[PDB]
Amino acid sequence: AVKIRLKRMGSKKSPFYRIVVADSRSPRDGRFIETVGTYNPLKDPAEVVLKEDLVLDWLSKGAQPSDTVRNILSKEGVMKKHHEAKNVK
Amino acid sequence: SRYTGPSWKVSRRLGISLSGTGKELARRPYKPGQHGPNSRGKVSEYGMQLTEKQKLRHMYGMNERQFRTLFIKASKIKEGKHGVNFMVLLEQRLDNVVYRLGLATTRRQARQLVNHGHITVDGKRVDIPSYHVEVGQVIGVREKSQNISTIKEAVEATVGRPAFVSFDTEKLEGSFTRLPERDELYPEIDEALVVEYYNQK
Amino acid sequence: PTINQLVRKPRKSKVEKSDSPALNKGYNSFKKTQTNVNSPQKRGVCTRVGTMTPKKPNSALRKYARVRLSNLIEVTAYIPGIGHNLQEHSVVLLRGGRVKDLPGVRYHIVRGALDTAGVNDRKQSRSKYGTKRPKA
């Protein structure tokens, strides 16, 4: 039940967010296995700061990227590349 | 307590004119108190380094703990003397760019100017008086309402203008030219009475 | 000493006392408990009142306050200030400090933070004796 997800680093008013990749038994900002990506919550068009190297390696193992990961990596087409290089493979 | 002094009694007590021979000389060399002339025995080196550090602290009006942390920034460099590189890094406050360019006449005028957003740098506003100005930031004067007379009143009163910055009063534009050094930027104050006081404070 | 003789002994330290014994409170209630209570200050009550004259060769009549805390032990403590606002059988806070006037006393009671008042002469040391800013 491995699962890639997000992680907050806020202050009071202005947050900063990070993608994080883990197993779903764990808490969100708690433990994990390794690291994937981040993104700016402010200044749209914000800073799409992605690894885009471990998502397809990680879903080769088989996981479930969450709701935000699918949209903001379909902006980079990684989920499009997921069913483009895995349903075609 | 941030700044109160009328630039009379501090220049009286420490002794050096603070700092460009802009004096008030009818009452200077005798210190205040109920014994003006009727002085007493010699000064301990406690009091010597005391008034010495208070002389360099009143080069700005700044804070003792900020002087501490800026002194600790001067040890990261690992070239040259630690007092000399502190003395150089003493002179890259935004207010130091204000005074040594020729846009004002004193540091309190520098801080009262830069308090209310009256200057910018490189087409971007800086609010704080203590920004770290490197070499390359072409300092500006916020050309919205620069017809205010006291800017050019301080410019055209060409009293104290050093010769290590390249600057033209035509555009009111210029940049901090290159590196200063000890032998050029204000003798005579210190090379070691800082680096000895700050071990056993 | 030689080094294996330093191996088979541990070189113990010089374990220190502290001249504030009453600020480490091995309670009575309920089950006569222990101390975890490294305090700045402890509040207590009165048991008697009086004065004291010191050793040779100092000569006056200093006053004091003997205090029982909640741990059923009694210490004599000193009074600061001019005008003792406290009286017999009254709640009293303590502050720690050794005093070289007499054997026995090693504390001084508070002025101007609790049940006691403070100063009405000093307009220059107003943080001490717990009576700050008067408009006069």
């Binding site: - | 040259g80 003397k81 630690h82 007092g83 000399v84 070691a192 680096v195 000895e196 071990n199 | -």
Partner: protein, 163 residues
């Protein structure tokens, strides 16, 4: 040796005592003084004397002091290496510092080493703290110091294969 009294020198008076000797009836009181004299270029000395008042005492001390001066072999306004000197309870540690850091030393040993023209040095008082034996052990430790051309000259080899 006799370093002459023909150099520009500078003084600093370290400390004075008031010292008795009982006579039948009253009490004598005389002062001593412990004065160092230096060129702040690399020649320093010390001395003492007693009299009945302060300026006469320090005059006699400066009179004594210029008979004795020491070489203090410098390199870059810093010691060549680490030297420890001891004279009757006066253990003094002295150690070369980083160039531009200053003198990190106490009361009397600063009054020697600043006056002898040392920019950068570290020290630590250890043992006795009367101001006489401090100064004497200081000057004894500064005596105990070598130099590269000296050492390579003493051995049959040359310098710059050992620096």
């Amino acid at each position: 040796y006799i370093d002459p009294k023909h150099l520009e020198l500078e003084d600093r008076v370290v400390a004075i005592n008031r010292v008795t000797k009982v006579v039948k009836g009253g009490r004598r009181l005389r002062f001593a003084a412990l004065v160092v004299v230096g060129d702040k270029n690399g020649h320093v000395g010390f001395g003492t004397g007693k009299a009945q008042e302060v300026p006469e005492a320090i005059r006699k001390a400066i009179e004594d002091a210029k008979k004795n001066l020491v070489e203090v072999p410098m390199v870059g306004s810093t010691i060549p290496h680490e030297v420890i000197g001891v004279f009757g309870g006066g253990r003094i540690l002295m150690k070369p510092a980083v160039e531009g850091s200053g003198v990190a030393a106490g009361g009397p040993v600063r009054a020697v080493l600043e006056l002898a023209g040392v920019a950068d040095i570290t020290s630590k008082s250890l043992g006795s703290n009367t101001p006489i034996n401090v100064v004497r052990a200081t000057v004894e430790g500064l005596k105990q110091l070598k130099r590269a051309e000296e050492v390579a000259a003493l051995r049959g080899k040359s310098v710059e294969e050992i620096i």
